[model samples]
Target chain A: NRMYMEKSQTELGDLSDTLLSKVDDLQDVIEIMRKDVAERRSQPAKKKLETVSKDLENAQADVLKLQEFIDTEKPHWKKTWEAELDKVCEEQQFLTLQEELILDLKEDLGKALETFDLIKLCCEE
Target chain B: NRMYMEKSQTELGDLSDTLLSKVDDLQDVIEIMRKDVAERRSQPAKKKLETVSKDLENAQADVLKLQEFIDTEKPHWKKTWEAELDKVCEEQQFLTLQEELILDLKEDLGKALETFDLIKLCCEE
Candidate 1:
């Protein structure tokens, strides 16, 4: 039981790492979008820029939630085998929510990237 | 200008096709998760099943939104060069939203899979 508990702990750590990496990915894309938005000189383009910025903010919130889970929740479960088992089910639910939000954020970033591409192309002409 | 408008239309078509493929992928994963959920005999597991089901429903809604854009919005843009250019920018924004939602759904499904794996391991003992 202890060994199984440890294994579960390890999995949670790995998941936390994955979420951080995804946050980094989102940051990278948002940087590019920022630059692209800055280059656009039109009113409509600026409005669209606001939309993407909001999306990024939403994504950032998701990252924060995942980070909070890793920092606060995961450690709370590590005290003993019984504690671990008691919370494992809840942990599963929490992780599911985190994963869903992160993926949503990624998709938002992707959409921002697509918008940037279109804006850049239009600006060039 | 006409050629550029045609190019934009083509891009929209391609994007629509991509969205369709993603919907297919989501369908395949949901099928597996459904089976896994059905096999579980625990109260907690059944509750988790409902959560996954809700996530799937949200994902399906995203797909429907994209489908609506492709069927209605894209065709409306194709009628004239002015219409195409006017709507292209909005189209980009729309696609971004779709991509983000679909990704969120994918992540939710992934979480369901992880939960199933954990539950299966626990039940085996």
Candidate 2:
């Protein structure tokens, strides 16, 4: 019975040593976990993400304003200017079509008026 | 010495039991860590973040195109059209100013030509 207790004590001593070593190994595992978690908390990646997100949101506002201009204001401006141009063009052409005939009559009147000027210049009475 | 050995063996037994319980508790802690890590691996949030990032990039391309159009094409188009309209307007105005004088001369010609027609009509003898 004494020998049996001695052997059991020896085995318990071995088990305790093993458990103690295991405690140290678990601490290493915890340190590894902490290191892994520490890697994830990198502030630069988070800051970059926030910067991109804000840039995207600000660009969306820019895109919406441009879209509104293209959709509403641009078309109206084009239409108004195009109509004004066409009206001016048509009025100019309409008068252009009659200019030649009116010029011929003015040529005849100018010759007759010049003869009247000569007749006055030669009048002795 | 035997009594001291017996006391040492009892304490070893309690330590072994406590270590075994500690193993079980560490398993629970490992499970909790696994759950925490699992929560961080959420795909939806990742997907949303990537989607936003991609959308922002695509929108940047869109913004550059619109900006180029606004900066280059729109101004050029407006300038060209406005100059064309102004030229046509000035040409139309230039001829418009001369219409009244030309019309007066034509009226005088028409009256003189009507007198010739009246003189011919009265020559019935």
Candidate 3:
């Protein structure tokens, strides 16, 4: 049973990595959109930038939904895995590099949004 | 059973209201900070701005923690409430004005963070 629990935890850790990578991918897309928003010189380019902006919004929403699900479920798994480990496992120990990366990604996300708002302000004037 | 679940849902809804109100209060602080950041031209005012920026960062983190807790718990209550309302209840019907307000607050939060980032960018140059 102990070994099985370890296996389950390992699986969750891998999933966390996958989610973090997705966050990075989303961030990249947002960066591209930001660049396009700045550089677009023609109507077609502007339209493409607008489309990418919408996609970026959807990607952000998707990432948040996924994160919410993980945040909600992690406590249960942590408890179960800790019980199996006999000695309590620190919560920090469970957070893979990717999990930490997600938090960093959030800071980047805030920056991306800041760029979006500034662009809108410029366009309005 | 139905009465008990309704009562529980009502309590959660009320808690949600209190949280939403807190978000609004935080937003007000951020707004004041933004105004001060824009107007402060002297050394003393600049020092005040730095302190306020730190305060704003802490406030944003606190709000996110509270929001994460609420988002993680709401689903369990949602399921419990829906089961009790099996006779038929619009999931939407369960959202009190305050509950809807919380979602709006999240949108406001996203915008506030955007402003914070933009202000930082301006300060850097």
TM-score (all chains, Cα) for each model: 0.24, 0.26, 0.27
**How does the DockQ of candidate 2 come out?**
0.01
lDDT of 2 by residue, A1-125 (tens): 22443343344335334433433443343344344445653222444334433533443343344334334433443455466677445544533433343344334334433543333333322
Fnat for the candidates in order: 0.00, 0.02, 0.00
> Model 2: how far is B72 from its true place, Å?
0.8
Local distance difference test, per candidate?
0.46, 0.40, 0.45
lDDT, residue A68, model 3: 61
What are the iRMS values of all candidates?
38.3, 65.5, 38.0
| Candidate 2 lDDT over residue span B1-125, tens digit each | 33532343344334334433433443343344344445663222334334443433343343344334334433443455466667545544543433342344334334433443333333322
| lDDT string, candidate 3, B1-125, tens digits | 43643454455445445544544554554455444434662122445435544644554565465446545655664565445344123222332332343344345435533643443343344
DockQ of each: 0.01, 0.01, 0.01
Q: What TM-score does chain B get in every candidate? A: 0.36, 0.42, 0.40
Better of 1 and 3 by lDDT: 1
Label model 1 with its docking quality class. Answer: incorrect
Q: Would you give the TM-score of chain B in model 3?
A: 0.40
